[PDB]
Design a protein around this ligand. Structure first.
Ligand SMILES: CCC1=C(C)c2cc3c(CC)c(C)c(cc4nc(cc5[nH]c(cc1n2)c(C)c5CCC(=O)O)C(CCC(=O)O)=C4C)n3C
Ligand SMILES: [Mg+2]
Length: 306
C-alpha cells in the first residue's frame, strides 16, 4: 500500500475559516478589517466558498480510485496536504507515517514547476518525512507536458473556437495564463515562466490557434514586483493593437473552479472584454473530470516507472 500525497495551495472549507486562512497567507498577521471583508466579498461574488474546497477533495479521491482501478500492482491511499489550510502538508506526511506508509508518491495540483508553488511543497513534505523516518517520498515536479493534459485543453479550445460565430472566430485572441509569482523567483533560476510559455505553445499549436498570448494573473499585493503582464492589461493592449472581437482565456496554471478563475477571470477579465465590446470565453476547468483524473493518474504512474 503506497501513499498518494496530493498537494495544493488550499481554500477554506468554511466561510468562518477565511480570516484564519488569510492570516496564514500573511504569515501570522491578521488581515486588516477591510482587507478581510474584501476577500469575503469576492467569495460571495462567486456564489459562496463552500463548493471550492470540495473540488480538491474530489480530485484527490477520484485520482486514488482511478489509480487503484486501472492497475492491480499498487494500492494507493490518498492524503491531501495543503499550504494554508488544514490538513497542512506536514500533517499529511505525519498521518501517512502514523498509518504505516513507508513509500509515497506526491503530486501538486499545479502543472507548472515553480520554486514557490511546487518545490517548496515537495521540500516541506520530504523534510517532514525525513524527520519522522521510515518514509520515502518520490515527487512529481511538473506535468504541464503530459500528452493527456495538453489534449484536455486542446480539445476544450477547439470546441470553443468551433462554436464561435464567424466575425469572432477569425478575429479572436487566445490568452494562456497561470498564477503570477514575485519576479524574485529569478534569483533561483525558476523555470516557471518558461513552462507557462511552452504550455501555451503546446495548447495553441494543438488546437490550431495561430493567435495567442501568454499572461499572468492574480498577483498578490506585496511591496515586490510580480510577473507580468497581467491578463487584464494584456487583453486591453492586444485589443488596442488588433481590435480582437473575442478573447478566450485558458488559465492553464489552474486546475479548478476556485477564486482565481471564477473571479479574476470570469469577472475581472469579462469587465475588460465588456468594456472594449469583445466576447468573453473561458473553457471548462479540469476540476475532477474523468479525463483530467486519467491524465493525473498517467503522470503518477509514469513517475513510478509504471
Ligand atoms: C501560486 C499559488 C498562489 C495562489 C493560488 C495564491 C492565492 C492567494 C489568495 C487566495 C485568493 C490570497 C488571499 C492571496 C494574497 C496574497 N498572497 C500573498 C503571498 C503569496 N502568494 C503566493 C502564491 C499564491 N497565492 C506566494 C508564493 C506568496 C508569497 C510570495 C513571497 O514570498 O513574497 C500575499 C502577501 C502576504 C504577506 O503579507 O506576507 C497576499 C496578500 N493570494 C495571491
Ligand atoms: Mg487581483
Amino acid at each position: 500500500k503506497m501513499g498518494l500525497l496530493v498537494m495544493a495551495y488550499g481554500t477554506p472549507y468554511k466561510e468562518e475559516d477565511i480570516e484564519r486562512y488569510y492570516t496564514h497567507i500573511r504569515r501570522g498577521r491578521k488581515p486588516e478589517p477591510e482587507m478581510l471583508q474584501d476577500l469575503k466579498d469576492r467569495y460571495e461574488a462567486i456564489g459562496g466558498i463552500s463548493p471550492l474546497a470540495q473540488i480538491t477533495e474530489q480530485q484527490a479521491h477520484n485520482l486514488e480510485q482511478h489509480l487503484n482501478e486501472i492497475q492491480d500492482e499498487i494500492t494507493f491511499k490518498a492524503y491531501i496536504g495543503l499550504k494554508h489550510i488544514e490538513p497542512f502538508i506536514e500533517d499529511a506526511v505525519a498521518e501517512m507515517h502514523k498509518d504505516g506508509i513507508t513509500e509515497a508518491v506526491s503530486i501538486v495540483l499545479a502543472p507548472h514547476f515553480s520554486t514557490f508553488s511546487v518545490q517548496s511543497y515537495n521540500k516541506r513534505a520530504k523534510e517532514e518525512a525525513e524527520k519522522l523516518g521510515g518514509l520515502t517520498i518520490t515527487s512529481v515536479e511538473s506535468w504541464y507536458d503530459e500528452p493527456k493534459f495538453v489534449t484536455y485543453w486542446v480539445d476544450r479550445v477547439k470546441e470553443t473556437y468551433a462554436s464561435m460565430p464567424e466575425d469572432e472566430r477569425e478575429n479572436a485572441m487566445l490568452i494562456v495564463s497561470a498564477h503570477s509569482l514575485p519576479e524574485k523567483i529569478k534569483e533561483f533560476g525558476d523555470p516557471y515562466p518558461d513552462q507557462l510559455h511552452e504550455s501555451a505553445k503546446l495548447i495553441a499549436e494543438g488546437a490550431g490557434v495561430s493567435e495567442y498570448a501568454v499572461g499572468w494573473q492574480s498577483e498578490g499585493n506585496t511591496p515586490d514586483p510580480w510577473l507580468g503582464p497581467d491578463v487584464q492589461d494584456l487583453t486591453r493592449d492586444l485589443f488596442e493593437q488588433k481590435g480582437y472581437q473575442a478573447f478566450v482565456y485558458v488559465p492553464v496554471g489552474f486546475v479548478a473552479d476556485h477564486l482565481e478563475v471564477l473571479y479574476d477571470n470570469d469577472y475581472e477579465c469579462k469587465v475588460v472584454t465588456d468594456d472594449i465590446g469583445a466576447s468573453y470565453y473561458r473553457p471548462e476547468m479540469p476540476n475532477a473530470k474523468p479525463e483530467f483524473i486519467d491524465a493525473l493518474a498517467t503522470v503518477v504512474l509514469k513517475k513510478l516507472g509504471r
